[PDB]
Amino acid sequence: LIYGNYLHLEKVLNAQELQSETKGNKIHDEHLFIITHQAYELWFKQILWELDSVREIFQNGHVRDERNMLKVVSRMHRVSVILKLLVQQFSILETMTALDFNDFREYLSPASGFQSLQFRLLENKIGVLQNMRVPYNRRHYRDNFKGEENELLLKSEQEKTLLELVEAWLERTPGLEPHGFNFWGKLEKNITRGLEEEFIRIQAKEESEEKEEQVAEFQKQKEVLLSLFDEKRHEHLLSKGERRLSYRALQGALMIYFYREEPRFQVPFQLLTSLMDIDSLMTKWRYNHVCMVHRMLGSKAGTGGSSGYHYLRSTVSDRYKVFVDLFNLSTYLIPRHWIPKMN
Amino acid sequence: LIYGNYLHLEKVLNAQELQSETKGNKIHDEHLFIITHQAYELWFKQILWELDSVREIFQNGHVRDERNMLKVVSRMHRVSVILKLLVQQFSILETMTALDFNDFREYLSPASGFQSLQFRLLENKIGVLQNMRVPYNRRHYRDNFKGEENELLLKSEQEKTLLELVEAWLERTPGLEPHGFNFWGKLEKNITRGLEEEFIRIQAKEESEEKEEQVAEFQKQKEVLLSLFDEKRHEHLLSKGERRLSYRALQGALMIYFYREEPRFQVPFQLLTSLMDIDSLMTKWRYNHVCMVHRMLGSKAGTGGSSGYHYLRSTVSDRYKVFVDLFNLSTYLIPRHWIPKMN
Amino acid sequence: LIYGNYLHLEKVLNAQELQSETKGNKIHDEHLFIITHQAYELWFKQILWELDSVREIFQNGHVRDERNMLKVVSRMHRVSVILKLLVQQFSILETMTALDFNDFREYLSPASGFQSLQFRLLENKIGVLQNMRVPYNRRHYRDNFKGEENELLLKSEQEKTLLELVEAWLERTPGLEPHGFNFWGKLEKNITRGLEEEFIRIQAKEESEEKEEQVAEFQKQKEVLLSLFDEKRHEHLLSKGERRLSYRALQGALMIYFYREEPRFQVPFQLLTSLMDIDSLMTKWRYNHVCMVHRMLGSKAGTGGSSGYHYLRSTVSDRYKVFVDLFNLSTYLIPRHWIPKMNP
Amino acid sequence: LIYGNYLHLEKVLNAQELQSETKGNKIHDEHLFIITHQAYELWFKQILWELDSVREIFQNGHVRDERNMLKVVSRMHRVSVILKLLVQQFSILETMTALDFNDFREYLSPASGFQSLQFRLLENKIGVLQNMRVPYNRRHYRDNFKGEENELLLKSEQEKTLLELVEAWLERTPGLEPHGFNFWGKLEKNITRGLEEEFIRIQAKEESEEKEEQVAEFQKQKEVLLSLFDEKRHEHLLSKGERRLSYRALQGALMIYFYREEPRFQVPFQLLTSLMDIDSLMTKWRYNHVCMVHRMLGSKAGTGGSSGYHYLRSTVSDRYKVFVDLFNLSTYLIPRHWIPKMNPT
Numbered sequence A, B: 001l002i003y004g005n006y007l008h009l010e011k012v013l014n015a016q017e018l019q020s021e022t023k024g025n026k027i028h029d030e031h032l033f034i035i036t037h038q039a040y041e042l043w044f045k046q047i048l049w050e051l052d053s054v055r056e057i058f059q060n061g062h063v064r065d066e067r068n069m070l071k072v073v074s075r076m077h078r079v080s081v082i083l084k085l086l087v088q089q090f091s092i093l094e095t096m097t098a099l100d101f102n103d104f105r106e107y108l109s110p111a112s113g114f115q116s117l118q119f120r121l122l123e124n125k126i127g128v129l130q131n132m133r134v135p136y137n138r139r140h141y142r143d144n145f146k147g148e149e150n151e152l153l154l155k156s157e158q159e160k161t162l163l164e165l166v167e168a169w170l171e172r173t174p175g176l177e178p179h180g181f182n183f184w185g186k187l188e189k190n191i192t193r194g195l196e197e198e199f200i201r202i203q204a205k206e207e208s209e210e211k212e213e214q215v216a217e218f219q220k221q222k223e224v225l226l227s228l229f230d231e232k233r234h235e236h237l238l239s240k241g242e243r244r245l246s247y248r249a250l251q252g253a254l255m256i257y258f259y260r261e262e263p264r265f266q267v268p269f270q271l272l273t274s275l276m277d278i279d280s281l282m283t284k285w286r287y288n289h290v291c292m293v294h295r296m297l298g299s300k301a302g303t304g305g306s307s308g309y310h311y312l313r314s315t316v317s318d319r320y321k322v323f324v325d326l327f328n329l330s331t332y333l334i335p336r337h338w339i340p341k342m343n
Numbered sequence C: 001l002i003y004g005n006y007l008h009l010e011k012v013l014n015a016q017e018l019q020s021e022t023k024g025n026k027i028h029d030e031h032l033f034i035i036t037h038q039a040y041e042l043w044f045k046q047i048l049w050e051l052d053s054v055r056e057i058f059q060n061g062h063v064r065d066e067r068n069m070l071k072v073v074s075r076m077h078r079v080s081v082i083l084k085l086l087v088q089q090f091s092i093l094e095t096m097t098a099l100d101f102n103d104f105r106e107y108l109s110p111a112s113g114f115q116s117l118q119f120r121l122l123e124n125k126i127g128v129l130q131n132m133r134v135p136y137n138r139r140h141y142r143d144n145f146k147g148e149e150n151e152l153l154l155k156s157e158q159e160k161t162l163l164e165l166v167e168a169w170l171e172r173t174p175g176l177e178p179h180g181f182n183f184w185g186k187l188e189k190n191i192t193r194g195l196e197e198e199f200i201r202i203q204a205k206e207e208s209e210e211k212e213e214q215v216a217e218f219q220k221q222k223e224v225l226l227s228l229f230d231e232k233r234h235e236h237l238l239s240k241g242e243r244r245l246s247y248r249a250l251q252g253a254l255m256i257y258f259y260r261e262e263p264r265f266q267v268p269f270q271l272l273t274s275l276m277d278i279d280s281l282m283t284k285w286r287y288n289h290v291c292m293v294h295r296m297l298g299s300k301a302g303t304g305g306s307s308g309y310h311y312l313r314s315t316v317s318d319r320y321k322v323f324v325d326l327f328n329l330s331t332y333l334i335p336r337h338w339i340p341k342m343n344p
Numbered sequence D: 001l002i003y004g005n006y007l008h009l010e011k012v013l014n015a016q017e018l019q020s021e022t023k024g025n026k027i028h029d030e031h032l033f034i035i036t037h038q039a040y041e042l043w044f045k046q047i048l049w050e051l052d053s054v055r056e057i058f059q060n061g062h063v064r065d066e067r068n069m070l071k072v073v074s075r076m077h078r079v080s081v082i083l084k085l086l087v088q089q090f091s092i093l094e095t096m097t098a099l100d101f102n103d104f105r106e107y108l109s110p111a112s113g114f115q116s117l118q119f120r121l122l123e124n125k126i127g128v129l130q131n132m133r134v135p136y137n138r139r140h141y142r143d144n145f146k147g148e149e150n151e152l153l154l155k156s157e158q159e160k161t162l163l164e165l166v167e168a169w170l171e172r173t174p175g176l177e178p179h180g181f182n183f184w185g186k187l188e189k190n191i192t193r194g195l196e197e198e199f200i201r202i203q204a205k206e207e208s209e210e211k212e213e214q215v216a217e218f219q220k221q222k223e224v225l226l227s228l229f230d231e232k233r234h235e236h237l238l239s240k241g242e243r244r245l246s247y248r249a250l251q252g253a254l255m256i257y258f259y260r261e262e263p264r265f266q267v268p269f270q271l272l273t274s275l276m277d278i279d280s281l282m283t284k285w286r287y288n289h290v291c292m293v294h295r296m297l298g299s300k301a302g303t304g305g306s307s308g309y310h311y312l313r314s315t316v317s318d319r320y321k322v323f324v325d326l327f328n329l330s331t332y333l334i335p336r337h338w339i340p341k342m343n344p345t
């Protein structure tokens, strides 16, 4: 073929219709606003392309096969790389002044950011749960989409999410077997014994101002480290939304996290890293978007009532962090010797 | 002289003393931790060097002289550039694993993060207020310091801060004069007349859901826009800490913000931009530091039974933003034609 | 009005046709290759949109009017910001392996990067010159285009380029007037007297190997500074292509460069800076692209009998630098006191 | 200990002596110039710390042991990360104007950028050879040093470089054994038969314009792919300096490069990638340092009538790229099916 025809530039480079130009008063900066979003949507399409291919590798149940595992890790890293660029893409819109923006703002109404199907699909496919999704202007997230788009968005809710699939894989981690290696058993013993060593040692220190603080630190460290073995706490925190992964998935995640230097757990750890990197960048994107909406509209300007800036500020939270459990693995790090070994 | 002697490399490259190596068990990654902090401290010294030079240009009262104004804007931009790099410097410490970090963590005690004199001076010299700051372990920030350091740290609180100096400059903005150009007067009249025209436009509009939805938004925006002309409200918000700049400073800031395209207001706006950039990057530094402490240490782990991650997450707030008023200027943007004519 | 309809997502998100998928054997990484180029082309469209608006502000002859000058500087800075991002966009294609790329490479032929109309227009509108443009496999860039495209590409060559327009503006700089301020005169005298004083200073020093180093450097710098006032040398370098701006434009550029701290020359300098940034980033884009063609195809693999990597290596040079004269202004920097004082 | 004492800030933050201030006329921007270099030198110290630890892991001969292999790959990646930041650090010095720079430039003489011991050690320890070093003002790089420094710089030349150590490791790659798996044998046969099959499809009537260029390209590709198996050519290119790795090392590198998707060759490939990244970033550092030396003092000025810019422009070349052979692995890229099948050997 020919470059332009292969890339369908007859469609791509003929999709720029300025509403200010259509309504007479053509505003120059409107073209930047069009291109920016079109670039974002092209990248969301690519993110979904990678995400759906990764999801299907899991659905086949052959993720553990080293060749398929690499495809997952690499494509997950790619999404991380795309998102990294997408955060930097805000710097283009920083060149647009608040004044020049408002010259065309009026022509954009009533079109909303909530009408970005690709962003919504991307959120749903990762594992952003609808139940613990903050509602704007007493209106639900799916009311903006009314048609074949609503049908496609329902599929993303129903179908197995990336979190659901990663949970499944984490549950099947070798070494968790109580009759086999028994990681959870061995760990509980070394930790309880490690803390007994620690409590007596913080007591075998001179009665200073530092001790009333260290004793109180112990009651919270001991609480955190042992609550790991309390399954009822885990089941209560899951219902609240404070935890996403199942108890067995959490055990698998901790195993990979501790044995990250081991050859068998290097690549599974890389995947966990990529899942955390995707979540951090999804947050940085939301944060950089919040700043953009504050610079252009203000902390009070919204849609027929409540400010848009205050709804979006509540989306830049740990509730929107799908792989929140993976971030909390670091709260349970124990000295190297306390980790059960091998022969 | 000679490269090494000029750069005093006999001091710089002979300041790396590994505590794990001193206490026998040498940990390799400890050297990375030393170098990173030494690089940060060199950059904080440079930030303070620029900041103090900018502060003294203001103190002389000749900041309005175009030649001195350029020195300020350029040096303020430089601080923005240094901070941009310091945020990126976290990526170096991302190469250190949580496991390898804990191997030397023990040797670091009792040295703390808020024992960094340069960072504290940097906060104080910008205008981070002592009353408007969150305490860790019910202790003050100055209690960790003693002697000559505590003496130097009190000077930064007492002496005129960058905010105090910018406020002073903003108060002396030409055009605010009520018998001169009378910007504030002209503005208030234009906003009243503007809202009136906007109202009869919404009133004559065909009675719908969007007609009543627009009335609710009009009433909220009308309230907001005229709240700007209530000086006692401003005075009450200043005491609460919700605002930092004086009422006359806020008027000057709004003048530069609206007339940013004017030749007389391009450079003063660049300064306001750089000040906002500094505040944004100071936040991004705090945020990137809190992501580092959440994956190196725990969400509950800290010093003396305290927050740790939770305290450093309360610093990543608008209360630590010194130039908060400058960010809120956007919440008062009015259509281009409502802005009073300059000539 | 709806988001998708406003942004014409029915066109944009329905323009992804994988050739490997069309020919059966669907290659996954091909979709990344499509999206990447489509993103690049959307950004080239935006760069051209800004560039053409800047060019028309100049063509009206009212660029010296501070309000129009700001529009130019700001939009030129925006192009710099867009280019900065496109350089970083190569990092996306770094995730694609050489192996996975060759699985679909076959399905792309005979389509070439030389068929990117927008990139060619972008080069021509800035002021990349055809006569001093390296030819690939004994074939000119315009041979790869036909019809309406070839007609539109001819217009970009004929019409006033950004360089031609900036040159025009630089020629009309106040202070160059020999009967007025006479900058070039004052500068020539001052550089002569300055070098004389600097010579007394080096000569009165103690005879050592440090003195002979300062001598050889003074002699070299004396040659460079005095060669600036040689207009025929400039005229000869212009014909060779080693310089692009006219002698009077070069004088205006030096004036802005020295008086950059002055209120009247702050914004004109910002423009000069922006142009240099655009040239630097256009080079960094070419460099980051030649580093991808090497990694994906190799040092010797080309289209015809010629090497792809070797040709693209010849574009990452100073001949493709439109604003090359602006980069060389630093070679003529003189001590602050040698600079002629300003008239109030 | 206390933060300041642990980090020896009494040394670090008391090492800033402005020469313009010492000679009366204090220039503000001089402090930026001091801090920038001090930051660079701290990072060069850290790069050397990682580099020397990586070099000793190789010298022990236990680099193939998966646990030690990871230490190497990770620390090599860290150097890549530090260098990435060092390239971005030039943006700090971009805030300094050419005019403000020249106000203090005079006070810096006769100190030179060549007097950076750490940078020289870093170059020598990687594998930048003295035989292929471009000379400035007809003065060798070692002449700018004296005493203990000159003694320490000689050690870096003598001792096994990172290239020498990587070459050694590449030579011992499993599968190269002619009686074992015999990769080079299998590969040679497959490339010959592969080229034959392509020639039969090309030479199959349709004498057009496109067909002749396709013959010209086949003939050029056939030449390059076959010249790979000519060990005589390789040893001639090694003596010229156009290649750095030994013929057996090149074979090992190609094996990892083709079998990169294999579980046994994932981590060795990551190392090769990190080595190439280090080489790319070392170049980007030199290039960004060339742009800066052009913006300040121009393109003609330097030392003793010799151009500073022009010399640093000649260091941006492929001659300074130590792992140049690794970059050229992409030139001998063959269709997936031509690559020999992996059997347990």
Ligand code: HEM
Residues within 6 Å of the ligand: A036, A037, A040, A041, A093, A101, A111, A112, A113, A114, A116, A119, A289, A292, A293, A296, A297, A303, A308, A309, A312, A315
């Ligand atoms: C001029 C800059 C921008 C402004 C002022 C802006 C404003 C807003 C506002 C006010 C909202 C809340 C919903 C609404 O009324 O639309 C929103 C939502 C959103 N915006 Fe933007 N936006 C901007 C740029 C972007 C860009 C460049 C993208 C990328 C495609 C984007 C994607 C979205 C998405 C996906 C949402 C829904 C977010 C969520 O529910 O979590 N916006 N935007």
Ligand code: HEM
Residues within 6 Å of the ligand: B036, B037, B040, B041, B093, B101, B111, B112, B113, B114, B116, B119, B289, B292, B293, B296, B297, B302, B303, B308, B312, B315
């Ligand atoms: C391994 C990575 C790091 C960890 C785990 C870490 C941990 C902490 C912790 C827990 C705190 C709270 C106070 C304390 O107990 O010390 C803190 C404070 C602080 N850290 Fe670090 N830190 C790290 C890296 C850095 C770096 C690279 C710098 C730069 C010099 C830095 C500068 C500071 C400063 C200035 C504070 C006081 C912050 C405030 O009060 O707002 N930290 N750090």
Ligand code: HEM
Residues within 6 Å of the ligand: C036, C037, C040, C041, C093, C101, C111, C112, C113, C114, C116, C119, C289, C292, C293, C296, C297, C302, C303, C308, C309, C312, C315
């Ligand atoms: C897989 C990565 C890429 C490879 C291997 C590649 C390869 C090449 C090659 C070999 C050429 C020489 C002409 C030809 O045969 O096409 C070329 C030219 C070109 N490529 Fe690419 N390219 C890549 C990515 C890109 C991207 C992402 C863009 C951005 C749109 C791009 C834009 C161009 C342009 C505009 C030219 C003409 C350059 C000139 O004449 O100065 N290429 N590319």
Ligand code: HEM
Residues within 6 Å of the ligand: D036, D037, D040, D041, D093, D101, D111, D112, D113, D114, D116, D119, D289, D292, D293, D296, D297, D302, D303, D308, D309, D312, D315
């Ligand atoms: C104001 C910016 C700078 C200028 C004008 C500058 C100029 C130069 C010049 C002219 C040379 C050639 C030798 C000489 O006469 O010194 C050189 C060499 C060098 N510079 Fe700089 N330099 C600058 C910044 C830096 C920085 C920030 C570093 C980092 C430490 C650096 C490191 C070096 C090194 C290591 C060399 C030797 C390079 C080689 O032989 O390959 N320079 N510099």
Ligand SMILES: O[C@@H]1COCC[C@H]1[C@H]1c2ccccc2-c2cncn21
Residues within 6 Å of the ligand: A037, A105, A108, A109, A110, A111, A112, A113, A114, A297, C002, C003, C006, C007
């Ligand atoms: O409703 C939004 C108000 O601010 C301006 C953009 C408005 C809206 C919008 C309309 C058309 C095309 C894109 C976008 C967009 C992205 N994020 C929010 N949106």
Ligand SMILES: O[C@@H]1COCC[C@H]1[C@H]1c2ccccc2-c2cncn21
Residues within 6 Å of the ligand: B037, B105, B108, B109, B111, B112, B113, B114, B297, B303, D003, D006, D007
């Ligand atoms: O208190 C911190 C707990 O985590 C480990 C580092 C601890 C502390 C620390 C000890 C020694 C030298 C520097 C620093 C530093 C900077 N920011 C935090 N720190």
Ligand SMILES: O[C@@H]1COCC[C@H]1[C@H]1c2ccccc2-c2cncn21
Residues within 6 Å of the ligand: A002, A003, A006, A007, C037, C105, C108, C109, C111, C112, C113, C114, C297
């Ligand atoms: O001719 C190029 C050889 O390498 C593969 C891509 C080939 C060509 C190509 C074909 C189709 C779509 C885009 C591109 C592109 C960008 N820069 C070069 N190209």
Ligand SMILES: O[C@@H]1COCC[C@H]1[C@H]1c2ccccc2-c2cncn21
Residues within 6 Å of the ligand: B002, B003, B006, B007, D037, D105, D108, D109, D111, D112, D113, D114, D297
């Ligand atoms: O030789 C260089 C000419 O330009 C000014 C700096 C000169 C020289 C220099 C003097 C003192 C301290 C550091 C450096 C350095 C690093 N790279 C170049 N330099």
